[PDB]
């Protein structure tokens, strides 16, 4: 049950790195919306960033948190230097994809998938 | 005479190849004396350096020296000698003569599964 | 000389496609006025030279 750390000895400085990454994303969102001609507002982009962080918010392993921070920094660099395009940025919103309903009756009416 | 070019890009001609090889080999031996006596790297590197120093003291001609050394050009031999010296410094820092750091898992190198 | 021989080959290529109408037909369809040995003709009307 004793493992080798990546960057963080425990969860506290891992959360510090998470807060730093969230700060960088929060600062970079308005520049992205201004630079790439995005239909979205600045509020929607920061909401999406918060949604992604809260999607990953359930993890408690410092190594997994460090790797998530590394991946987030890679995506942040891909957004800072314009390598992600408008399509790549708007892929986070899934606006063309209809969502599967979460209720048993709708899943029963649609098909056999649980 | 003097070699016009070494035939390799970026490898300048050494005017005095014998004394440069001599000082590189002596510095390598001097830093090899700081290794532990049971270090296999120390023993093997001392063997190699002593053989090359013996032939560089024996042969005064550059072409026959290259033929004896069998390391390409004498400038390549000088470059290999200084890389060996830097490796000796790094290996003294690393200390790899110690026992194995950690055993692998039982089926780590078992192929096929 | 050989220039007059080239001109002879040219005038026979011009007057070797039947008439003026045949020359114009082959020149505006195939963009080519070379004379070849008629190897055959298929049932659909294609000529092969």
């Amino acid at each position: 049950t004793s493992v080798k750390p990546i960057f963080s000895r425990d969860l506290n400085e891992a959360k510090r790195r998470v807060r730093e990454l969230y700060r960088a994303w929060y600062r970079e969102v308005p520049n992205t919306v201004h630079l790439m001609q995005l239909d979205i507002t600045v509020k929607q982009g920061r909401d999406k960033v918060r949604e992604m962080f809260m999607k990953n918010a359930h993890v408690t392993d410092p190594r997994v948190v460090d790797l998530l921070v590394i991946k987030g920094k890679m995506e942040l660099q891909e957004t800072i230097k314009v390598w992600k395009q408008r399509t790549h940025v708007m892929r986070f919103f899934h606006e063309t994809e209809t969502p599967r309903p979460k209720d048993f009756l709708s899943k029963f009416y649609m098909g056999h998938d649980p | 005479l003097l070699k016009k070019t070494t035939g390799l890009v970026g490898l300048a001609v050494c005017d005095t190849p014998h004394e440069r090889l001599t000082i590189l080999y002596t510095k390598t031996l001097d830093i090899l004396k700081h290794f532990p006596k049971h270090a296999a790297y120390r023993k093997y590197t001392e063997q190699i350096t002593n053989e090359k120093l013996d032939m560089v003291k024996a042969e005064p001609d550059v072409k026959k020296l290259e033929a004896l050394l069998q390391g390409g050009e004498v400038e390549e031999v000088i470059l290999q000698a200084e890389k060996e010296l830097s490796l000796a410094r790094k290996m003294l820092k690393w200390k790899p003569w110690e026992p194995l750091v950690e055993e692998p898992p039982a089926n780590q190198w078992k192929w096929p599964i | 000389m050989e220039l007059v021989e080239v001109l002879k080959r040219g005038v026979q290529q011009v007057t070797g496609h039947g008439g003026l109408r045949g020359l114009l037909r082959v020149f505006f369809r195939a963009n080519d006025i070379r004379i070849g040995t008629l190897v055959g003709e298929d049932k659909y009307g294609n000529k092969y030279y």
């Binding site: - | 035939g7 | 195939a30 963009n31 080519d32």
Partner: protein, 178 residues
């Protein structure tokens, strides 16, 4: 062994005649003039352009073109639904379904080749034990919709009936090598 492509051996020293030759080479653009002369020679050569579609580039009997399903001289289909072509198809471009026929013969009920998926490699025609599936030499079968390149058994049998006069001759010319 090895050789030098740009290393010069010794020196040519300096001479008044050699200096004047190099001066004339620099000033009068001699290598540029001979490059012009090379292009002029190519201008006065004969072009290598064929008159397509009235002239076609040469091919061989081994040429792998549009797929076809052949028959025996009796008219029975050669295919026996063995799915060796489907098994060896590297792109999984062949779909085969089969059942016994009304006379008990082992025949396909579905033979589809996705020509948009096929890589035109001939593995099907070299894995077929009865020479049923072949790549006949047709290559001018480009379509205007994606659907028309999704061949089924009717299309492949029609191709085999259309190109049998040429496919049989190519197999006759080729089969001793394979």
């Amino acid at each position: 062994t090895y050789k030098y492509v740009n290393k010069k051996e010794q020196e040519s020293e300096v001479d008044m005649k050699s200096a004047t030759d190099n001066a004339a080479r620099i000033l009068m653009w001699t290598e540029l003039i001979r490059g012009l002369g090379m292009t002029l020679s190519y201008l006065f050569r004969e072009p290598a352009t064929i008159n397509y579609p009235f002239e076609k580039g040469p091919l061989s009997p081994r040429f792998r073109g549009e797929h076809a399903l052949r028959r025996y001289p009796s008219g029975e289909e050669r295919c026996i639904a063995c799915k060796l072509c489907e098994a060896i198809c590297p792109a999984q471009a062949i779909t085969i379904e089969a059942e016994p026929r009304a006379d008990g013969s082992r025949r396909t009920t579905r033979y589809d080749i996705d020509m948009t998926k096929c890589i035109y490699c001939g593995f099907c025609q070299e894995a077929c034990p009865v020479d049923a599936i072949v790549e006949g030499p047709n290559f001018e079968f480009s379509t205007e919709t994606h659907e028309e390149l999704l061949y089924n058994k009717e299309k492949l049998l029609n191709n085999g009936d259309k190109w049998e006069a040429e496919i049989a001759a190519n197999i006759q010319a080729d089969y001793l090598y394979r």
